[PDB]
Structures are given as C-alpha cells and as structure tokens.
C-alpha cells in the first residue's frame, strides 16, 4: 500500500535558536536565562552549553544548500529576543535584526517558505532579574518585540509562530526548575502559564491591528493520554493528566476558558487565583491554525499515591521500544491525538510543528550515519499522519524535528534528532540517510509503507 | 499459460576474449595474467590453456553466420586489452584495433547489435610486473585503453560493460589465488576491489567526457542470499555474506558507499583502509542500466566455526538438482534477486550479461546434442525473468552464456555451458537443441510457461 | 504531381580547370601548386596526377557538341592562372588568353551561356615560391590577371565567380595538407583565409571600377549541420561548426564581420589576429547573387574530448545510404540550407554552382553506364531545389557537377562526379543514362518526382 499526501501539503524541518545558532555574546546580543543556566555547574548533561552550539549563525549558507539539497519546501526557525532587544525592551540592535532579515531573503531566494517561531525559550536575562515571565510587564514587553518583527519581516513570511510549548517553560522552567530559569515554585509556575498564553493574545490582536498577510498559531506540546484500563477510575485519571498537560493550553486558547477538572486539583491544594475574564477573550482570540509537538504517549492508571491522584502505568509502558530518550514508541498515539483535536475544537486547521526521534548515532566505517530505527520510527509515525488526512483531518503541514543535531537542553547534546550529523568539535555536517529518505518522501510526495 | 517479453526487449548471448578467442600470441598480442597462469602446472585442470579455445580470431565469420542462424539480437564480447596495448600503455597495435573494428561493422551488417565488455580478465602480463591491480597506475593505463575504443568503435555500440564479475577477480585471482594472477593476500584482494571500482568510475567519467551516444554500465557477479532459517543470526549471517560478495560492489556504483556490516568484519581482523572520499563519489558517477551475472543461489547459516561468521547450509542445498557446476537450480532465486535490485538502489534499468547453465553433453548416434536438461534449466529460470517484468522490473536485455562451448578458467574445458557444442580437436561448431530452442524463443518473443 | 521550375531558371553542369585541361606544361603555361603537389609521392591516391586528365585543352570542341547534344543553357568552368601569368606576374601569355577566347567564342557560338571562375586553386608556383597566399601581394596579383580576363572576356561572359570554396583551399591545403600546397600550420591557415576573402574583394571593387555589364559572386563549399539532439550543448556545437566552416566565408563577404563564436574558439588557443577594418568593408563590397557547393549535410554533436568543443555524430550519420565518397545522402539538408542562406543574409540572389554525386559506375555489356543511383540522387536533391523556390527562395542557377568525369584531387580519377563518362586511357566520352536524364530535366524544364 503506497501513500501519497494531499498535492498542496507542506513538508518541513525544524530548529530553535539556542539549539543551534550559537554565538550567545557576539553582535550586541544580550545574555539570555539560557545562557545563564547552562554557565552552572548542576544544570546541563556533563557541563555542555549552547555558547557554540552548531554555530548556525556565521554557517547558515552550508545550512539552507544543505536545506535545498534535500529541498524542504518549509524551514520553521526561532528569532533571539536577545538578539533583537539586548534589554528586553528599548535599544534596537539593528545588528541582530539583519541577521533574521538576510536569512530569510536567502530561504525565500533558493526554494525554501519561511517559519518563524517569535519565543523559542531565550527570555532576556534582564527582564528575569525584574520577575521574568511572573512580572506581566514582560507579556507587553514581547508585544514590542512582536511589533519590530511583524513591520520587518510580517507579510513575506506566512507562517507565524508565537510561543515553542509553553507547557514545558512552566512546568521545567518555573515548578521543577530542571529548565532556564531555575524556579521551583507551583503558585508561580501557574502565574507564568497565563502570563505566556496572554502574550501569545497580546501577539495576535497586534498581528490583526497591522493586518499582516500572513497565518499566526502557537506550537503546543500535546500527547495522546491513554487509561491503563477501561474503568472509570482510570479514564477520569487520563483526563486529569491532559487537563493538567495539554487542555490547560488548548482550551484557553481555542474554547477561552480553563479546564475545571484541572482547576478543581488546583484548590484542592489551597490555591485559586481570578484570571481577569477579559484576558481569556484576549487568549481566545480566533487564530489561523493549531501547531503541536508530538513524539510519544502517556499511560496514565488511578494512584492515591502521588499529590495529582494518578502516576504512569510503569509496565503498560514497558511493552514498547524506547527512543534513546526513555519515550515509548507508539505510532498510532498521533492518529488518535490529530482525531481528538479533530473532533474536539471544531475540526480546526492543524500544523505539525515538531514530531522526530533521538537515537544513539554513529559514524560507520563508511563515513555514513545508518539510523534505520529513525526512518522506521519517521515512516510508522507519518502513516498514521496520512490516516488521519484520510479520514478527515485538516492536517496542512509537517515539520521533522530537528534539521541538524543540536543542544537537547538539559540532556546537553547527548541526544540527537538531526537529520543531517553534526560533529560538535569540528562543525562538519553529514546528512543522515534519514536525512536522505526525507528527501525522496518529499519528492515523491510519499512512500510505500 | 504462454509468456511473451515486451517488444522491445533484446534477446542476446555472451562470451569473452580469452575464454573463445585463442591465437594467444599472433598479430603483436602481449601476454595476459591467464596466458601467464595457464601456462605453470597445477591451476587448470588437466594442463588445459585458452592458446587455442574456440579459435573465435580466425573462425568469427563462421560463429556470426551461426548467430544469426539461432537470430541473436545482441552479441555480448570482449576485448582483449593486450592486443590493443601489448605492455598495457605507449604502442599501439593497430592490428588489434583493426580485428575488432572488423568484428563489431560484421556484427552490425549482419542487424546484430554489437554489447563490448572492456576488462574480461586478460590484464597485460607486463601491468602485473608492476604490481598489476594492486598499483594504482593501472586504474590509469585501464582509462587510456577505454580512450581508444571509444574514439573508434564509440557511437556505433550501444551497450558497453566497463568491468566483468571484479568480486571474482579480487577473490579467487587475488585471496585464493585459483584465478590469475594466483596471488593470495587478503590486504591486497580489497586494494585491487577498490582499485577496479575505482577504474569503472573513471571510463565512465571519459566515456562522458567524450559524449559517446551509447549506454555504459558494469556486468557484476550476483545471486541471492537466503538465511537458512528465519532465525536473528541466520538472517544476519546472509546479510554478511551478500555484503562481501555482490552489495561490496553495488553499494559503492549505486549509493557512493562500502557496506558496513561487511566492512566491520575486515576491521574485526585487524584491517582498516581510508578509501579517499574523492574516489567513492567518482565510482558512484551515474550509469544507464546495472548489469549482472546469475546462475545459482546460496543458503547461508550462522558459523562460529568459519572465521568468516557463517557458512553454506549443505543440509538443504543437498534437497535441489545440481547442475555439473556443484550449483544448485532454484529458478525463482532470479526474480527475488531482480526484485532485491529493483527494491534498492531505485528501480534501476537491469540487464542480464550472463545466465546459462553446465551439463554434461554428448554428441548422441544422431551426430546431436539433445540437451534437455539445459533447455529445462532455461526456461525455469526465463519464466521467473519475465515474472519480475509483469511484476514491475525494468529487465531490459537477457544474454545467454555462453554462445559457444569456451574455456571455463580453473576448470579448463571440462564444463560446457554453450548452446553451439565445439569439438576443441577439429574446432567444429554443432549448435546444440538449447541453440534451436532459442531460436524459436526469440522469434515467437517468448514459450509457454 | 509534375514539378516545373521558373521559365528563366538557368540549368547548368560545372567543371574546374586542372581537374578536365590536361597538357600541364604546353604552349608556355607555368607550373601551378597542383602540378607540383601531383608528382612529389604520398598526395595523390595510386599515384594519379592531372597532367593528361580529360585532354579538355585539345579535345573541348568534342565537349561542346556534347553538352550541346544535352542542350545545357550555362557551362560553369575556371581560367587556368598559370596560363594567363606563368610567373603569376608580368610577361602575358597571349596563348593561354586565345585558347580561353576561343572556348568562350565557341560556346556563345552554339548558344551556350559561359560561367567563367577566375581562381579553382591552380595558383601560379612561382607566387607559392613568395609565400603563396601568405604573401598579401598574391591578393594584388590577383587582381592584375582578373583585370586582362575582364577587358577581354568582360562584356560577353554573363555570371563571375572569383573563388571555388576558399573554405578547402585554407583549411585542406594549409592546415591539414592533404591538399596543394600541401603546408600544415593553423596560424598561416588563417592569415591566407582572410588574404582569399580580400583578393575576392579586390576584383569585385575593380569589376565596378570597370564597370563590366555582367554578374559577379563567389563559390563557396556550405553544408547544414544539424545537431544530434535538440539540446543546447549540441545545438550550440554544431552553430560552432558552421562557423569555423561555411559562415567563416558567409559572413564577411555578406556581412562584413567574422563569426565571434569561431574567433573565440580560436582565442582559447592564443590565436588573435588584426584584420585592418578596411578589408572587411572591401571584402563585403556588394556581390550580384552567392554561390554555393552542396553535396552532403553533417550531423555534430556536443564533444569536450575534441579540442574544437565538438565532433561528427556517427550514431546518427550511420543510418543514412552513403556515395561512394562515404558522404550520407539527405536531399532535404539542401532545402533547410536553402532557406538559411535566404533568413539570414536579407533574401539575396542564390546560384548552386555545385551539386551531384559520385557513385561506382561500370560500362555493362550494352555499351552504356546505367547509373540509376546517380539519377536517384540528382532528382531527390532537385526535389527540395524546387521546394526551396515555391516557399519563396531566390534561388537562379543550378550548375550540375560535373559534366566529364576528372581528376578528383587527392582521390585521383578514383571518384566520378560525370554525366559523361571518360575512360582516362583512350579518352573515349560516353554519356551516362544521368547525362540522357538531365537533358530530358532541360528541355521539359522539370519532372514528376
């Protein structure tokens, strides 16, 4: 059974800025909470920063003729705030302006749409010493910064990213602090999750105000939450998980309100807090498509231990083969997700920002990375993608995290979803023959599964 | 069930210079590796040579005549390069030139479509005095005496075969030293595997060059591995093998690279060799078709006994009939294997340079072959031919070898794989059934199943 | 369907003076390059010479009663320099003018138009003792023996031509020397190309300074050279190969410029050389009509191997019927030609002062040559001649070459060109069933193709 995707459907890669750009103190830009957390010893895998990173930012021509070599017809990117506004707010760096302004003229020159994500996770250092994404200051201070991007870059880039998974950002960044910035705080952890999704409406309404002819969204991280069982106990526990998770962003930003049952677990602990009503219509604002990463599933069963009432299934979990991350492999999880948010949201437009895998790569004898668990992972995945185009879905775009080997954050550079090998110590890039399937897939629009 | 191939599909035969031609030393030919080989006791069987054979160089007015009379559409040959060039490089023998000038405008007035081979083992002795394969130069003096052909002959062949079966010449010629030069080294057997590659990539890059409106290729010895068992190690162990055999020279012309599987175990006895990357990307220079040679197929099991890893299955390969060659017949061992190359390697154009089979023949009282067993093997392996033709295969030719009974190397005369029986006494030519058989199939285009 | 030429259309056959004259050292004539290139070894084929030839210098009045017999309306033939100025300068040979003379006045006489060439390559060897063509006064001497024609044969002689195909004379006799003078150097190859262009010039300009009431042009040798495929490599090889060939000679006579794709070939192996401007306008002085020599056409293809950039397309030239001379025969490559002189140098006046064949003729046992290929030939090539002038060709004259059998240069009497058969012992005229053909063409002015 060959499978052909529809003649108009978009293929893609995609990188974030500290992932890859490197040059963290060169052209004026500012220190970012990135660039701070990795300089501290306890933070990243083995001590490694972004500092260097792949160092896209002087070698971006290698990177678009390897781009059009492979000939993506989308390049989804992150623009540096810091890069932009050194300060958050006030002194324009031109420098770093016409940086992202030439590097778009070069996709747009050889065959390539651009993509821009506008807060891939490098808040200026500066705005985190006066609160950071707590202080709802920050929220106008990213308009501004909107602003320069949209006037410059606005109608000549037609998809629009505002926020990179701002469910991670709160959760890693604000209660765990295993992410930039450090805080570990729940009551601040939940501040910060509203402050995002405001700014992101704050984006919008602006984005509409100067009429940009162009299609703004908001890249979500979404999972599929599967029960342990078919109990009542379990199914409601699978609920709660999402709630907490994924709704707490989807339904804010596409029914205009909170999920209950996740709120009601907030109070249960002795915190409520009024969101202003007139904020969630100004989050809710109608936006021209749902972006989501995607790259596993969650088994959630029924746990009076733990404070969410609910735990993972540990060994429904242990039937599948992991990633090198720990994430099980489950391609049918995407299918039912793309259904869900089908479904549920009125069979809106969707756009896959993210979906990949890491697995150990190395270079043969041959000189070439065989990564024949990534293509088989990439094809599963992309069937089920294709099923659901099938069966209704209004699925517009796919973007294969990542393009190149980059810094996986915590994890250091440990991890690798590239396509296209990078050797950290000499900046050479090779192609991975994942890299090259991807190629012929957009070539030919599809492949015999 | 009746089978008829496509319209335009060319029924041929083959055959080679040193193996048909003789007059080993007539006209200023130098020595050749296998005059050389020939001449020392011990490597043919029964003090046998190709001095004479067939005797094709004077006698070739005879064998077109008889060509024509069976009505093969393509003639398959070779030429002797130390008849061109008796030191490998400098004169020119123009008395050599000349002959197969004279060969090839017979064939084409005669409406036979001419199909050269340039390196069908008969390397001049004095190249080999300098090392032969193992020195590089020769990769060198092979694009000179390809220059030569080219600007005569040229426009006026449309198929052309750069090298014939270089896994066996490296192997046997090089390892084991059976074949000429009798040299036995493992070290030097891969230098001389890359350094034939490397040959076939720069006549192809000249054969541009020059612009020659004809289609270039290289005829590869090939069957199909099947694991004795469908077991992790079986499969794993047949996998080796076809990577050492046949895919350590298909992957290098079709996909730039050396199999790694194979190459891992070279470098788990102790040998590594940096093929220059500049040389991979010469041999991998696009090609108009693959051809290759089948006759068998190998069952292969896992062996921790052999140092290799594996070993042949006798258990079940002692289940098939045996051609006079220990082979086994699996007919339906073809179509996997076209299946294999049209599966990798993308769908490529594919033609058969050799299939054929070797029984014992007797001239019978009716002064007649009656060879039923060739025939029977034929057409069992030609229904599986066409079969991948229905089922999508760009099978474009079909040559049989061998056109006349010749001298099969290391076993001297002793194995007849003909179609035209020769009395190598009197050099008689009695075209055997399996010739008049052949006859009809290329006139109806086809037989019943 | 009858095809019918113009009522004014002039039907011819040609002859050259050294080819049919004999009696190379008479009545005081100077040794010209061809007598000298004729008797030194190695030039001509089996040793021939045109030291005797057809004897036409004694035996012109049984020529005349020939072509008169046939009843052609202009006989194209070439005045003998070295027997006007045997020293190419100075003392006049009063014999030389009285046998020309007399031919002339016996042609008039018997109502036959005359169609005089004043240089067929018999250049004085005296001059080739100077320099030859080399030596820019050759060019002035020129013009003195064009002079003392002019004030004799002036008036009565209706079409001139200066030069026979310049193109050959430069090309086989100074760079290739295959024939007279026999010199191999490309620089001086040329220099004499240009020095034959400005003596063409030079008699034209005192043709007007006399103002003799005749036609004056030039002959040149042009075939169409087509490209082996419609792709831009080929096409722009063959544009090339025109250049270098005909349009070399086109081009400055009816444009007053060099082609800039040959010179640029030729400065690519540090060749310039510095025309003075005013022999360009002097070579374009204006000219009545352009005549051409057209027997084949020539099939280039695309070759970097050849330091020319390109080379004959044998693949295609080998499935056309050849002449004897191995020339393909492809009569509508005559109307393409046809029409690219009339496109691209303003719808001039045409003449063919060349056309026709040589194929093997035998004298059967009937006494007469039967050459039916001959005709065939003639009326296919006469086909597309008239084509030409219904879709609008100013085409005037057609001169068939050549009457008699002759001296085919370097081929030696080896090759017949004739209408008339000469057997080159006796010197025994016997038309050829073409001669009986054309006379027919005459006088019905046509024929049904």
Known sequence: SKITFPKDFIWGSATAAYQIEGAYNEDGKGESIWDRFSHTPGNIADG?????????????????????????????????????????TGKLNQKGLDFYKRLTNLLLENGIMPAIT??????????????????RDTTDYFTEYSEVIFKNLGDIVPIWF????????????????????????????????????????????????????????????????????????DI????????????????????????????KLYKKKGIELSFPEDDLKLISQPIDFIAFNNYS??????????????????SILEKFEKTDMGWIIYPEGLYDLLMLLDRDYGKPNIVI????????????????IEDTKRIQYL???????????QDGVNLKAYYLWSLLDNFEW??????????????????????????????????????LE
Request: proline share 4%; aromatic share 12%.
């Open 118 to 135: 506008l807060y891939h996770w490098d808040l200026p250092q500066k705005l985190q010493d006066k609160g950071g994404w707590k202080n």
């Open 162 to 233: 505002t926020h990179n998974e701002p469910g991670v950002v709160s959760l890693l960044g604000h209660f765990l602090g295993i992410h930039a910035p450090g805080i570990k705080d729940l009551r601040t952890s939940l501040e910060v999750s509203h402050n995002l999704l405001l700014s992101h409406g704050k984006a919008v309404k602006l984005f509409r105000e100067m009429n940009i002819d162009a299609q703004i969204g908001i890249a979500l991280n979404l999972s599929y939450h599967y029960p342990a069982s078919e109990k009542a106990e």
């Open 379 to 389: 094809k599963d995945y992309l069937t089920q993608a294709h099923r659901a185009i």
């Open 48 to 88: 490694h920063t972004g500092d260097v990173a792949c160092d896209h930012y002087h070698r971006y021509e290698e990177d678009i003729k390897i781009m059009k070599e492979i000939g993506i017809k989308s390049y989804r990117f992150s623009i540096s705030w810091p890069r932009i506004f050194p300060e958050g």
């Open 410 to 447: 915590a994890y250091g550079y440990n991890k690798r979803f590239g396509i296209v090998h990078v050797n950290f110590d000499t900046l050479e890039r090779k192609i991975k023959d994942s890299g090259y399937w991807y190629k012929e897939v957009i070539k030919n629009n599809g492949f």
């Open 236 to 263: 409601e526990a699978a609920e709660l998980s999402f709630s907490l998770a994924g709704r707490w962003y989807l339904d804010p930003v596409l029914k205009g309100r909170y999920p209950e049952n996740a709120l």
């Open 297 to 314: 599933s969650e088994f959630i069963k029924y746990d009076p231990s733990s404070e969410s009432g609910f735990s993972p299934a540990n």
């Open 353 to 368: 920002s993210e979906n990949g895998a890491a697995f150990k790569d190395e270079i043969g004898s041959n000189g070439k």
